[PDB]
PDB file of C-alpha atoms in Angstrom:
ATOM      1  CA  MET I   1       0.000   0.000   0.000  1.00  0.00           C
ATOM      2  CA  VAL I   2       1.079   3.575  -0.770  1.00  0.00           C
ATOM      3  CA  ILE I   3      -0.308   6.498   1.220  1.00  0.00           C
ATOM      4  CA  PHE I   4      -1.563   9.363  -0.953  1.00  0.00           C
ATOM      5  CA  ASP I   5      -1.270  12.989   0.215  1.00  0.00           C
ATOM      6  CA  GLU I   6      -2.879  16.105  -1.301  1.00  0.00           C
ATOM      7  CA  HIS I   7       0.312  18.174  -1.083  1.00  0.00           C
ATOM      8  CA  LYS I   8       2.554  16.280  -3.516  1.00  0.00           C
ATOM      9  CA  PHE I   9      -0.298  15.854  -6.006  1.00  0.00           C
ATOM     10  CA  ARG I  10      -1.236  19.543  -5.888  1.00  0.00           C
ATOM     11  CA  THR I  11       2.304  20.857  -6.352  1.00  0.00           C
ATOM     12  CA  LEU I  12       2.901  18.222  -9.042  1.00  0.00           C
ATOM     13  CA  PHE I  13      -0.210  19.297 -10.986  1.00  0.00           C
ATOM     14  CA  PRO I  14      -0.821  23.048 -10.551  1.00  0.00           C
ATOM     15  CA  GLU I  15      -4.013  22.756 -12.615  1.00  0.00           C
ATOM     16  CA  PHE I  16      -5.471  20.678  -9.755  1.00  0.00           C
ATOM     17  CA  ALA I  17      -4.705  23.342  -7.135  1.00  0.00           C
ATOM     18  CA  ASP I  18      -8.144  24.567  -6.035  1.00  0.00           C
ATOM     19  CA  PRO I  19      -9.631  22.515  -3.156  1.00  0.00           C
ATOM     20  CA  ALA I  20     -13.109  23.764  -4.082  1.00  0.00           C
ATOM     21  CA  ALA I  21     -12.758  22.571  -7.678  1.00  0.00           C
ATOM     22  CA  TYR I  22     -10.978  19.318  -6.701  1.00  0.00           C
ATOM     23  CA  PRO I  23     -11.890  18.184  -3.147  1.00  0.00           C
ATOM     24  CA  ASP I  24      -9.529  15.963  -1.158  1.00  0.00           C
ATOM     25  CA  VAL I  25     -11.963  13.031  -1.026  1.00  0.00           C
ATOM     26  CA  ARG I  26     -12.199  13.063  -4.836  1.00  0.00           C
ATOM     27  CA  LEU I  27      -8.417  12.740  -5.150  1.00  0.00           C
ATOM     28  CA  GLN I  28      -8.336   9.994  -2.517  1.00  0.00           C
ATOM     29  CA  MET I  29     -11.120   8.057  -4.265  1.00  0.00           C
ATOM     30  CA  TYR I  30      -9.331   8.253  -7.603  1.00  0.00           C
ATOM     31  CA  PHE I  31      -6.106   7.081  -5.940  1.00  0.00           C
ATOM     32  CA  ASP I  32      -7.932   4.053  -4.550  1.00  0.00           C
ATOM     33  CA  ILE I  33      -9.300   3.434  -8.050  1.00  0.00           C
ATOM     34  CA  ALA I  34      -5.854   3.745  -9.686  1.00  0.00           C
ATOM     35  CA  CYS I  35      -4.559   1.142  -7.217  1.00  0.00           C
ATOM     36  CA  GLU I  36      -6.426  -1.497  -9.266  1.00  0.00           C
ATOM     37  CA  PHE I  37      -4.774  -0.484 -12.546  1.00  0.00           C
ATOM     38  CA  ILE I  38      -1.290  -0.421 -10.998  1.00  0.00           C
ATOM     39  CA  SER I  39      -0.862  -2.422  -7.808  1.00  0.00           C
ATOM     40  CA  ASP I  40       0.808  -0.294  -5.134  1.00  0.00           C
ATOM     41  CA  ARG I  41       2.601  -3.283  -3.570  1.00  0.00           C
ATOM     42  CA  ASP I  42       6.056  -1.758  -3.092  1.00  0.00           C
ATOM     43  CA  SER I  43       8.857  -4.323  -3.389  1.00  0.00           C
ATOM     44  CA  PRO I  44      12.581  -3.888  -4.108  1.00  0.00           C
ATOM     45  CA  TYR I  45      12.527  -6.557  -6.847  1.00  0.00           C
ATOM     46  CA  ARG I  46       9.886  -4.746  -8.926  1.00  0.00           C
ATOM     47  CA  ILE I  47      10.712  -2.712 -12.013  1.00  0.00           C
ATOM     48  CA  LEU I  48       8.170  -0.180 -10.725  1.00  0.00           C
ATOM     49  CA  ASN I  49       9.760   0.263  -7.309  1.00  0.00           C
ATOM     50  CA  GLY I  50       9.574   3.205  -4.939  1.00  0.00           C
ATOM     51  CA  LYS I  51       9.178   6.760  -6.166  1.00  0.00           C
ATOM     52  CA  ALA I  52       8.886   5.666  -9.811  1.00  0.00           C
ATOM     53  CA  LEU I  53       5.848   3.552  -8.903  1.00  0.00           C
ATOM     54  CA  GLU I  54       4.452   6.424  -6.835  1.00  0.00           C
ATOM     55  CA  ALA I  55       4.881   8.789  -9.795  1.00  0.00           C
ATOM     56  CA  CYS I  56       3.106   6.278 -12.048  1.00  0.00           C
ATOM     57  CA  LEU I  57       0.157   6.127  -9.642  1.00  0.00           C
ATOM     58  CA  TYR I  58       0.041   9.929  -9.384  1.00  0.00           C
ATOM     59  CA  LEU I  59       0.012  10.300 -13.174  1.00  0.00           C
ATOM     60  CA  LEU I  60      -2.853   7.815 -13.467  1.00  0.00           C
ATOM     61  CA  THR I  61      -4.811   9.724 -10.816  1.00  0.00           C
ATOM     62  CA  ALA I  62      -4.306  12.874 -12.875  1.00  0.00           C
ATOM     63  CA  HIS I  63      -5.554  10.944 -15.933  1.00  0.00           C
ATOM     64  CA  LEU I  64      -8.740   9.781 -14.191  1.00  0.00           C
ATOM     65  CA  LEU I  65      -9.313  13.241 -12.713  1.00  0.00           C
ATOM     66  CA  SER I  66      -8.982  14.807 -16.173  1.00  0.00           C
ATOM     67  CA  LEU I  67     -11.618  12.450 -17.576  1.00  0.00           C
ATOM     68  CA  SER I  68     -13.858  13.214 -14.599  1.00  0.00           C
ATOM     69  CA  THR I  69     -13.667  16.993 -14.951  1.00  0.00           C
ATOM     70  CA  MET I  70     -14.245  16.586 -18.692  1.00  0.00           C
ATOM     71  CA  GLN I  71     -17.441  14.700 -17.841  1.00  0.00           C
ATOM     72  CA  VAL I  72     -18.779  17.044 -15.147  1.00  0.00           C
ATOM     73  CA  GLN I  73     -17.945  20.298 -16.952  1.00  0.00           C
ATOM     74  CA  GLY I  74     -19.058  19.143 -20.415  1.00  0.00           C
ATOM     75  CA  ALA I  75     -20.175  21.341 -21.973  1.00  0.00           C
ATOM     76  CA  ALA I  76     -22.996  21.236 -24.533  1.00  0.00           C
ATOM     77  CA  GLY I  77     -25.462  23.930 -23.460  1.00  0.00           C
ATOM     78  CA  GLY I  78     -24.438  24.505 -19.867  1.00  0.00           C
ATOM     79  CA  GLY I  79     -24.254  20.959 -18.537  1.00  0.00           C
ATOM     80  CA  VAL I  80     -23.562  17.317 -19.323  1.00  0.00           C
ATOM     81  CA  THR I  81     -24.897  15.877 -22.577  1.00  0.00           C
ATOM     82  CA  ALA I  82     -26.317  12.389 -23.088  1.00  0.00           C
ATOM     83  CA  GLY I  83     -23.694   9.657 -23.334  1.00  0.00           C
ATOM     84  CA  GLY I  84     -20.833  11.871 -22.150  1.00  0.00           C
ATOM     85  CA  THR I  85     -17.827  13.197 -24.050  1.00  0.00           C
ATOM     86  CA  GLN I  86     -15.570  10.350 -25.151  1.00  0.00           C
ATOM     87  CA  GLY I  87     -11.823  10.380 -24.626  1.00  0.00           C
ATOM     88  CA  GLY I  88      -9.139   9.318 -27.077  1.00  0.00           C
ATOM     89  CA  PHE I  89      -6.270  11.130 -28.748  1.00  0.00           C
ATOM     90  CA  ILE I  90      -7.139  14.112 -30.958  1.00  0.00           C
ATOM     91  CA  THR I  91      -5.377  13.230 -34.211  1.00  0.00           C
ATOM     92  CA  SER I  92      -6.526  16.343 -36.087  1.00  0.00           C
ATOM     93  CA  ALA I  93      -8.357  19.498 -35.033  1.00  0.00           C
ATOM     94  CA  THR I  94      -9.554  22.628 -36.811  1.00  0.00           C
ATOM     95  CA  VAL I  95     -10.860  25.844 -35.245  1.00  0.00           C
ATOM     96  CA  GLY I  96     -11.638  28.679 -37.640  1.00  0.00           C
ATOM     97  CA  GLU I  97      -8.681  29.226 -39.943  1.00  0.00           C
ATOM     98  CA  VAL I  98      -6.328  27.302 -37.621  1.00  0.00           C
ATOM     99  CA  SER I  99      -5.739  23.606 -38.306  1.00  0.00           C
ATOM    100  CA  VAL I 100      -3.497  21.131 -36.465  1.00  0.00           C
ATOM    101  CA  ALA I 101      -2.642  17.540 -37.416  1.00  0.00           C
ATOM    102  CA  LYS I 102      -0.676  15.477 -34.897  1.00  0.00           C
ATOM    103  CA  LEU I 103       1.093  12.145 -35.231  1.00  0.00           C
ATOM    104  CA  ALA I 104      -0.965   9.199 -34.028  1.00  0.00           C
ATOM    105  CA  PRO I 105       0.412   7.185 -31.090  1.00  0.00           C
ATOM    106  CA  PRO I 106       1.303   3.519 -31.714  1.00  0.00           C
ATOM    107  CA  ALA I 107      -1.673   2.362 -29.636  1.00  0.00           C
ATOM    108  CA  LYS I 108      -1.933  -1.358 -30.393  1.00  0.00           C
ATOM    109  CA  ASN I 109      -4.070  -2.088 -27.325  1.00  0.00           C
ATOM    110  CA  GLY I 110      -7.105  -0.704 -25.526  1.00  0.00           C
ATOM    111  CA  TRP I 111      -5.104   0.191 -22.414  1.00  0.00           C
ATOM    112  CA  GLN I 112      -2.546   2.141 -24.457  1.00  0.00           C
ATOM    113  CA  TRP I 113      -5.287   3.851 -26.479  1.00  0.00           C
ATOM    114  CA  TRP I 114      -7.102   4.920 -23.304  1.00  0.00           C
ATOM    115  CA  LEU I 115      -3.813   6.170 -21.847  1.00  0.00           C
ATOM    116  CA  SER I 116      -3.056   8.251 -24.950  1.00  0.00           C
ATOM    117  CA  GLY I 117      -6.301  10.213 -24.486  1.00  0.00           C
ATOM    118  CA  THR I 118      -4.783  12.551 -21.897  1.00  0.00           C
ATOM    119  CA  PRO I 119      -1.192  13.785 -21.459  1.00  0.00           C
ATOM    120  CA  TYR I 120      -1.086  12.393 -17.915  1.00  0.00           C
ATOM    121  CA  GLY I 121      -1.962   9.046 -19.449  1.00  0.00           C
ATOM    122  CA  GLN I 122       0.722   9.731 -22.049  1.00  0.00           C
ATOM    123  CA  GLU I 123       3.113  10.421 -19.156  1.00  0.00           C
ATOM    124  CA  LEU I 124       2.167   7.075 -17.603  1.00  0.00           C
ATOM    125  CA  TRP I 125       2.461   5.214 -20.916  1.00  0.00           C
ATOM    126  CA  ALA I 126       5.915   6.660 -21.579  1.00  0.00           C
ATOM    127  CA  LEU I 127       7.112   5.748 -18.081  1.00  0.00           C
ATOM    128  CA  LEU I 128       5.763   2.191 -18.342  1.00  0.00           C
ATOM    129  CA  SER I 129       7.258   1.690 -21.810  1.00  0.00           C
ATOM    130  CA  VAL I 130      10.683   3.026 -20.816  1.00  0.00           C
ATOM    131  CA  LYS I 131      10.696   0.769 -17.751  1.00  0.00           C
ATOM    132  CA  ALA I 132       9.460  -2.196 -19.827  1.00  0.00           C
ATOM    133  CA  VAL I 133      12.713  -3.340 -21.410  1.00  0.00           C
ATOM    134  CA  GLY I 134      14.008  -6.900 -21.332  1.00  0.00           C
ATOM    135  CA  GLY I 135      11.569  -8.957 -19.298  1.00  0.00           C
ATOM    136  CA  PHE I 136      11.512 -11.575 -16.565  1.00  0.00           C
ATOM    137  CA  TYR I 137      12.441 -15.236 -16.247  1.00  0.00           C
ATOM    138  CA  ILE I 138      10.242 -17.475 -14.089  1.00  0.00           C
ATOM    139  CA  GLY I 139      11.323 -20.876 -12.872  1.00  0.00           C
ATOM    140  CA  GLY I 140      14.710 -22.340 -13.652  1.00  0.00           C
ATOM    141  CA  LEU I 141      17.498 -23.403 -11.297  1.00  0.00           C
ATOM    142  CA  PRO I 142      21.283 -22.869 -11.429  1.00  0.00           C
ATOM    143  CA  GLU I 143      21.965 -25.988 -13.487  1.00  0.00           C
ATOM    144  CA  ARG I 144      25.300 -24.616 -14.695  1.00  0.00           C
ATOM    145  CA  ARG I 145      26.776 -24.298 -11.194  1.00  0.00           C
ATOM    146  CA  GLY I 146      27.236 -28.080 -11.009  1.00  0.00           C
ATOM    147  CA  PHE I 147      29.477 -28.374 -14.078  1.00  0.00           C
ATOM    148  CA  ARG I 148      33.148 -27.430 -14.243  1.00  0.00           C
ATOM    149  CA  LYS I 149      34.076 -24.657 -16.660  1.00  0.00           C
ATOM    150  CA  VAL I 150      37.083 -22.729 -17.962  1.00  0.00           C
ATOM    151  CA  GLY I 151      39.519 -21.437 -15.356  1.00  0.00           C
ATOM    152  CA  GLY I 152      38.220 -23.516 -12.464  1.00  0.00           C
ATOM    153  CA  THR I 153      34.911 -21.660 -12.374  1.00  0.00           C
ATOM    154  CA  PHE I 154      31.760 -23.141 -10.792  1.00  0.00           C
ATOM    155  CA  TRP I 155      33.306 -26.585 -10.336  1.00  0.00           C
TER     156      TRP I 155
ATOM    157  CA  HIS E   1      79.795 -36.973 -21.902  1.00  0.00           C
ATOM    158  CA  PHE E   2      78.984 -33.628 -23.554  1.00  0.00           C
ATOM    159  CA  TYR E   3      75.920 -31.993 -21.964  1.00  0.00           C
ATOM    160  CA  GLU E   4      75.728 -34.872 -19.477  1.00  0.00           C
ATOM    161  CA  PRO E   5      75.669 -33.638 -15.838  1.00  0.00           C
ATOM    162  CA  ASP E   6      78.706 -35.034 -14.039  1.00  0.00           C
ATOM    163  CA  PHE E   7      77.324 -34.163 -10.591  1.00  0.00           C
ATOM    164  CA  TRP E   8      73.894 -33.681  -9.023  1.00  0.00           C
ATOM    165  CA  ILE E   9      73.572 -31.461  -5.948  1.00  0.00           C
ATOM    166  CA  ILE E  10      70.660 -32.942  -3.993  1.00  0.00           C
ATOM    167  CA  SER E  11      71.091 -31.741  -0.391  1.00  0.00           C
ATOM    168  CA  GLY E  12      74.219 -29.597  -0.330  1.00  0.00           C
ATOM    169  CA  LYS E  13      76.536 -32.442  -1.305  1.00  0.00           C
ATOM    170  CA  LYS E  14      77.112 -33.277  -4.973  1.00  0.00           C
ATOM    171  CA  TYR E  15      76.504 -36.898  -5.952  1.00  0.00           C
ATOM    172  CA  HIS E  16      78.502 -38.158  -8.912  1.00  0.00           C
ATOM    173  CA  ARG E  17      76.788 -39.250 -12.122  1.00  0.00           C
ATOM    174  CA  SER E  18      78.096 -42.826 -11.936  1.00  0.00           C
ATOM    175  CA  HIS E  19      76.873 -43.294  -8.350  1.00  0.00           C
ATOM    176  CA  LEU E  20      73.207 -42.795  -9.268  1.00  0.00           C
ATOM    177  CA  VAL E  21      70.934 -44.059 -12.046  1.00  0.00           C
ATOM    178  CA  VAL E  22      69.199 -41.415 -14.168  1.00  0.00           C
ATOM    179  CA  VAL E  23      66.166 -42.148 -16.346  1.00  0.00           C
ATOM    180  CA  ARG E  24      65.146 -39.300 -18.642  1.00  0.00           C
ATOM    181  CA  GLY E  25      62.533 -38.564 -21.272  1.00  0.00           C
ATOM    182  CA  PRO E  26      62.860 -38.282 -25.051  1.00  0.00           C
ATOM    183  CA  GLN E  27      66.240 -36.469 -24.729  1.00  0.00           C
ATOM    184  CA  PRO E  28      65.755 -33.060 -26.429  1.00  0.00           C
ATOM    185  CA  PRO E  29      68.458 -31.735 -28.789  1.00  0.00           C
ATOM    186  CA  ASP E  30      71.631 -30.143 -27.503  1.00  0.00           C
ATOM    187  CA  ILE E  31      70.945 -26.432 -28.075  1.00  0.00           C
ATOM    188  CA  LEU E  32      67.854 -26.575 -25.841  1.00  0.00           C
ATOM    189  CA  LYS E  33      68.948 -29.411 -23.552  1.00  0.00           C
ATOM    190  CA  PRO E  34      69.842 -26.900 -20.761  1.00  0.00           C
ATOM    191  CA  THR E  35      66.343 -25.416 -21.132  1.00  0.00           C
ATOM    192  CA  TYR E  36      65.006 -28.729 -19.772  1.00  0.00           C
ATOM    193  CA  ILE E  37      67.597 -28.689 -16.927  1.00  0.00           C
ATOM    194  CA  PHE E  38      69.352 -31.510 -18.836  1.00  0.00           C
ATOM    195  CA  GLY E  39      66.361 -33.790 -18.356  1.00  0.00           C
ATOM    196  CA  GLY E  40      63.705 -34.840 -20.843  1.00  0.00           C
ATOM    197  CA  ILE E  41      60.486 -33.714 -22.481  1.00  0.00           C
ATOM    198  CA  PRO E  42      57.683 -34.236 -19.931  1.00  0.00           C
ATOM    199  CA  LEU E  43      54.538 -36.151 -20.810  1.00  0.00           C
ATOM    200  CA  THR E  44      52.668 -33.589 -18.698  1.00  0.00           C
ATOM    201  CA  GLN E  45      53.875 -30.932 -21.132  1.00  0.00           C
ATOM    202  CA  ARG E  46      52.792 -33.236 -23.968  1.00  0.00           C
ATOM    203  CA  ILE E  47      49.239 -33.684 -22.647  1.00  0.00           C
ATOM    204  CA  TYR E  48      48.125 -30.729 -20.515  1.00  0.00           C
ATOM    205  CA  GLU E  49      46.303 -29.046 -23.428  1.00  0.00           C
ATOM    206  CA  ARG E  50      44.911 -32.140 -25.174  1.00  0.00           C
ATOM    207  CA  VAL E  51      43.592 -33.474 -21.855  1.00  0.00           C
ATOM    208  CA  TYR E  52      41.953 -30.126 -21.077  1.00  0.00           C
ATOM    209  CA  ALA E  53      40.285 -30.015 -24.499  1.00  0.00           C
ATOM    210  CA  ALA E  54      38.982 -33.574 -24.133  1.00  0.00           C
ATOM    211  CA  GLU E  55      37.632 -32.949 -20.628  1.00  0.00           C
ATOM    212  CA  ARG E  56      36.006 -29.626 -21.529  1.00  0.00           C
ATOM    213  CA  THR E  57      34.301 -31.165 -24.568  1.00  0.00           C
ATOM    214  CA  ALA E  58      33.143 -33.999 -22.313  1.00  0.00           C
ATOM    215  CA  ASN E  59      31.750 -31.348 -19.957  1.00  0.00           C
TER     216      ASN E  59
END
């Protein structure tokens, strides 16, 4: 378990600074929810260990909070429309004479596609990808330590 | 008796060649006979690499 405090989250994300706009219980609830996506079991053998894992959890809480304020604020005609506003990465946008076309993320999976919808999710996806190099190896025993080798090594 | 040790110092004293019986290896040539301390070519020198290769391949 990882204890979540308002102070680190608020100075990490200055947009979420107003207690009135973002109550403490809302942040705590979204931290509990993000615990399911990334387990907060802190171990020294994990690739996500310590402050890196805490940063990952904080970025996901920012992601969920961004979706939530998108939902509550809307806005269609002064409220929330039917079916809500869907997330996802804005590939191309056009307002007036201004047009923007951005590169699409390599989202090959639903989790990655949902992450790419918000920059906090993009933060989390980048951190997970950069920590996800190599892999694990389950099972197996030191079979080689019972056989003599060059230079009198592991006789 | 060229390049044939006349005496052998074992413990201080020098035993004569005729007093003792010397058995030596394949008797290397003269120019590098002193390099073998006037002895012979050792079978350990002949098989410390071949034996290692055989044992490591067996491993």
